[PDB]
Amino acid sequence: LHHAVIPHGKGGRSSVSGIVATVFGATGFLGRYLVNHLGRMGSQVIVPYRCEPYDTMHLRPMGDLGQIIFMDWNGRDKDSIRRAVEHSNVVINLVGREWETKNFDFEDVFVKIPQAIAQVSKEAGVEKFIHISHLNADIKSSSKYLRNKAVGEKEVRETFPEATIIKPADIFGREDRFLNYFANIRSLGKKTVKQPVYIVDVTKGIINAIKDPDARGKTFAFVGPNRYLLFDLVQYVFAVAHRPRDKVERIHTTDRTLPHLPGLEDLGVQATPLELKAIEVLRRHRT
Amino acid sequence: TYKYVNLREPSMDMKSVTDRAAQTLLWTELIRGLGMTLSYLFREPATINYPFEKGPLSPRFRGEHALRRYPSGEERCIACKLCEAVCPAQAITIEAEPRADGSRRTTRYDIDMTKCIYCGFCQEACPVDAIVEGPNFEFSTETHEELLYNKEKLLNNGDKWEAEIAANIQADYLYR
Amino acid sequence: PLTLEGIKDRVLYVLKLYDKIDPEKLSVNSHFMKDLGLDSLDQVEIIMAMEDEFGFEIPDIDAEKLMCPQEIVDYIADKK
Amino acid sequence: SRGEYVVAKLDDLINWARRSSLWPMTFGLACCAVEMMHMAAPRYDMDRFGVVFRASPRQSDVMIVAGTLTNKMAPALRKVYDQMPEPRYVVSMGSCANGGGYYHYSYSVVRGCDRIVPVDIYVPGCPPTAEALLYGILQLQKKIKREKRLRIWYRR
Amino acid sequence: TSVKPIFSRDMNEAKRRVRELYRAWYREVPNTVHLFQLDISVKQGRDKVREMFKKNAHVTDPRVVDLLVIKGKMELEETINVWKQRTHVMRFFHETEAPRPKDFLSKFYVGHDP
Amino acid sequence: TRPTVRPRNDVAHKQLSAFGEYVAEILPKYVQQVQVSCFSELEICIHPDGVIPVLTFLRDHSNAQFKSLADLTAVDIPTRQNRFEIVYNLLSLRFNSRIRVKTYTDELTPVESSVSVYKAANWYEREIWDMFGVFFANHPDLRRILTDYGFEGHPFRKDFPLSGYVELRYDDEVKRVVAEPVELAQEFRKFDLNSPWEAFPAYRQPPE
Ligand SMILES: NC(=O)C1=CN([C@@H]2O[C@H](COP(=O)(O)OP(=O)(O)OC[C@H]3O[C@@H](n4cnc5c(N)ncnc54)[C@H](OP(=O)(O)O)[C@@H]3O)[C@@H](O)[C@H]2O)C=CC1
Ligand code: SF4
Ligand code: SF4
Ligand code: SF4
């Protein structure tokens, strides 16, 4: 490989680190934290957006002077995507709206988007492609979401086989979805056992796996440290917060471990519990 | 010599004290202030229509950081490092090499637009008037990458005009 | 209801309530500093912990002069 | 496609409504604040562009970071930045503020305000002449003219 | 050789003032971690405080101990007021890496740090 | 020699010479140097024990009033064991004259905190404590003013380099601003400008 891709000196603030990362998404939650930790590492991030430049503007100054770069992409043409992945060391695929739109279903984003980008990637010659997935996305019922993700999982596994297929559990953090829905309540009470995993251990694991070679080919799954009932967790949320259909079905659907695939322990990162970060993040209550 | 203030007394004569009482109970010099401000109301205000009328200047403004060149000739700079020796925020960066001809020249001539305080010392220090502070001041740049000039940007910016620069220098090569 | 033995029992269970002491191992001649492997940092921790427990301010030189469980109990029996 | 027609016309109307007045807050640490008050002067106007100088942070459309940002300044600067409505824009004025500048090699100084808040419009100079700053606010208005938020919302 | 010390006569008064200063820091911590709306357990903060005390235990010169006591008293005043913000208090902590260990081979990969 | 070179008055030189000789004779306990430059501004160089007695003398006595207090700094001179130089500067309201009370001091032993007789010296002494570390025993309040709180190093020393050791940046990891070891974007180049060839023959020190 050519120079100025090799690491240089210490880390942080335009110290030339290893990877040059083409990121799809990154305007959402986990991609934004991932660009944040690569900027702490000091890695050049090529991100295309499709929206207004104001969103990429308020996530712009994360990098140093001119490190990260912004361009355009679309979910239709191979030319713009291929132009975005002309010269890339690594590439990560994070995309998905949790409700169907006018022009996109749960189908063909999770299906059609990894097809074309994996096509131009394998014709391009990229390495360490990391594709996210939701945990326990099966061929089984109850979610067009989960079954289209399982189809995308089979696609990314079949074509370009040495992709890191990665999956966390349902993550919580500063801009969580399900804890926000726990705040945005009213009610109903069911039973489901569930393990929550905090977001920064997930993205620390992703950046460590993407900067550490020889850990490729294997799909990974991230584990919550507690793994107890959902309704006890809702009581915990109301207690710490001082106040007394697709999303609720997809949190009541399935939460299990899988003994097949390796997780946190083959990476060497400390797990932050639910309780500490939940007390940290449960602000914005009555006084 | 000194000329101090506030040495008087309120006059105990009846006319002066009833005049101060009339100002107290009749709100007089307040209305005098209103009259002065209405006199400035009935003036014509001195504004300039900005995108059409641009404000006046001098022939010796310090703007663009443009370069010059010889009459139908090569680059005026020698890379003699005087501007980087005088640059009080060290924004000049010169790395010099000679080319295949033999005359000494450059490789890299960078101005940091962040650090440039716009003194004029690199203009006064240049023995051949290679770098010249330019005439126009419109940078307004949306990205921080684009505010770091290269030598080729300076040559394009010196070849977008010389006639302004030549007119200003030819008017005022006698003061400096 | 404020005798020497009730104060010694409440000092006993707050010595149980302190975490790093392993085990309690109470004695009238215990000297938990060096015979039990503790620090003067932990000495001043325990002294102002008793201050936090049940009363008066216990200033610096009297905090230094104790170094011992029963001597703490007797100093409180002097002061309270 | 009169749906797209109504989207484009309504987006033009709302974005012209945004870029019409744009009353700022003048943060203004050092002598760049004096040059901002000199584009508040009677010659270079601000009434003409709907631009009302106003110390209120709660209603700040754009914010003109000017002066010299320091380490002691920066958390208070971002606390000023937080209590501010989410449609917001930033003009970094001054060589000190847009990259460290003359105090670039120093301690106690953040190397430009890029390391605290995002920057839409850089305007350099020492001081950036009030004429040039007013030009920078015009190119800010043209950035507001190109924003296509409602286009992205309709075809999202 | 005439040297005028600050407060000290032997290290007994040094021990006395530093244990009283540590008592002041102990009753200083929970009020501040409640006031600044912080995000750290009290055990971790107190253990980092006593770790910072145990860092400089290798000093026997009494003038240096006096000057350490005066510096710690200054910052205890400036944190018992509301003069120092959230930034400086978190700056005492290290939650942003800074991951650098002291292994030989780790410094041999990311090289030129002997 | 007369045009464009500033002429002087020997009369003021003789006046300050006689006055400094007088002060040196009548406070013998602490006077070490009384030096007068070419342009007649007095310097009195003092052991670090007579701070309070000499300043109580120089505030009063109706022969040297000198109520006006100015700068305090302790010019960092290495190649000495007494490094720092506390420079009192005094101006007379009655006599229109400037005297520089230079007392010498080391790193760790305090001079005696001139705020007792000079109410202008309070934030001056706090500034010197913040930037250097010259301790001031018998002082009301010593704090860090003109520095950051969490910053330390006493930066106006010569041992502290130009750039700081710490450098702030915001990060969205812990959602706040953190300090890091310094990562400069450029070198701060160092011009070896100390040219040879002895521009002043009068100020030659005797070599070995
Ligand atoms: N608990 C959780 O939320 C978990 C989530 N995940 C997965 O992580 C990923 C990121 O999640 P999250 O940040 O919460 O969600 P987002 O919707 O915010 O992330 C998706 C990103 O891709 C963009 N995008 C999505 N659909 C389209 C489209 N049709 N056209 C163009 N851009 C599109 C989004 O908006 P924009 O176009 O504006 O950039 C955004 O930038 C998702 O794929 C999710 O399934 C996995 C495990 C747990
Ligand atoms: S002073 Fe002039 S000729 Fe010399 S290096 Fe600078 S620009 Fe070139
Ligand atoms: S005007 Fe700019 S480039 Fe020229 S010497 Fe000054 S700072 Fe350097
Ligand atoms: S850029 Fe110049 S005018 Fe502006 S704050 Fe800095 S020194 Fe002052």
CSV table of N, CA, C and O and ligand atoms in Angstrom, one decimal, chain B residues 83 86-92 111 115-123, ligand 3:
chain,number,residue,atom,x,y,z
B,83,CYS,N,10.0,37.2,3.0
B,83,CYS,CA,8.7,37.3,3.5
B,83,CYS,C,8.4,36.3,4.6
B,83,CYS,O,7.7,36.6,5.6
B,86,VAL,N,10.1,37.6,7.7
B,86,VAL,CA,9.5,38.8,8.4
B,86,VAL,C,8.0,38.5,8.8
B,86,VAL,O,7.5,39.3,9.6
B,87,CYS,N,7.4,37.4,8.4
B,87,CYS,CA,6.0,37.2,8.5
B,87,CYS,C,5.6,37.0,10.0
B,87,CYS,O,5.9,35.9,10.6
B,88,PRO,N,5.0,37.9,10.6
B,88,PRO,CA,4.9,37.9,12.1
B,88,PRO,C,3.9,36.9,12.7
B,88,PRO,O,3.7,36.8,13.9
B,89,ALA,N,3.2,36.1,11.8
B,89,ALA,CA,2.6,34.9,12.3
B,89,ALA,C,3.0,33.7,11.5
B,89,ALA,O,2.4,32.7,11.6
B,90,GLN,N,4.1,33.9,10.7
B,90,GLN,CA,4.8,32.8,10.0
B,90,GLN,C,3.9,32.0,9.1
B,90,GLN,O,4.0,30.8,8.8
B,91,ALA,N,2.9,32.8,8.5
B,91,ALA,CA,2.0,32.1,7.6
B,91,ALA,C,2.6,31.8,6.2
B,91,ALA,O,2.1,30.9,5.5
B,92,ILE,N,3.6,32.5,5.8
B,92,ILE,CA,4.4,32.1,4.6
B,92,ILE,C,5.1,30.8,4.9
B,92,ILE,O,5.6,30.6,6.0
B,111,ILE,N,0.5,30.7,1.7
B,111,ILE,CA,0.0,31.7,2.6
B,111,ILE,C,-1.1,31.1,3.4
B,111,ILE,O,-2.1,30.6,2.8
B,115,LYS,N,-3.7,32.8,9.6
B,115,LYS,CA,-2.7,33.5,10.4
B,115,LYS,C,-2.4,34.9,9.9
B,115,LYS,O,-1.7,35.6,10.6
B,116,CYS,N,-2.8,35.2,8.7
B,116,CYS,CA,-2.4,36.5,8.1
B,116,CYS,C,-3.1,37.6,8.7
B,116,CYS,O,-4.3,37.8,8.5
B,117,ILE,N,-2.3,38.4,9.5
B,117,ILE,CA,-2.8,39.6,10.2
B,117,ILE,C,-2.9,40.8,9.2
B,117,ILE,O,-3.6,41.8,9.6
B,118,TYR,N,-2.4,40.7,8.0
B,118,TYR,CA,-2.3,41.7,7.0
B,118,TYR,C,-1.6,43.0,7.5
B,118,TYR,O,-2.1,44.1,7.7
B,119,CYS,N,-0.3,42.8,7.7
B,119,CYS,CA,0.6,43.9,8.1
B,119,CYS,C,0.9,44.7,6.8
B,119,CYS,O,0.6,45.9,6.8
B,120,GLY,N,1.5,44.1,5.9
B,120,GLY,CA,2.3,44.8,4.8
B,120,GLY,C,3.8,44.6,4.9
B,120,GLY,O,4.5,45.1,4.0
B,121,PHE,N,4.3,43.9,5.9
B,121,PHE,CA,5.7,43.6,6.0
B,121,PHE,C,6.2,42.8,4.8
B,121,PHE,O,7.4,43.0,4.4
B,122,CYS,N,5.4,41.8,4.3
B,122,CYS,CA,5.9,41.1,3.2
B,122,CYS,C,5.9,41.9,1.9
B,122,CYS,O,6.7,41.6,1.0
B,123,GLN,N,5.0,42.9,1.8
B,123,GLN,CA,5.1,43.8,0.7
B,123,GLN,C,6.4,44.7,0.8
B,123,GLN,O,7.1,44.8,-0.2
G,3,SF4,S1,0.7,40.5,5.5
G,3,SF4,FE1,0.2,38.3,6.0
G,3,SF4,S2,1.6,37.1,4.7
G,3,SF4,FE2,2.4,39.2,4.8
G,3,SF4,S3,3.9,39.3,6.5
G,3,SF4,FE3,1.9,39.9,7.4
G,3,SF4,S4,0.9,37.9,8.2
G,3,SF4,FE4,2.7,37.4,6.8
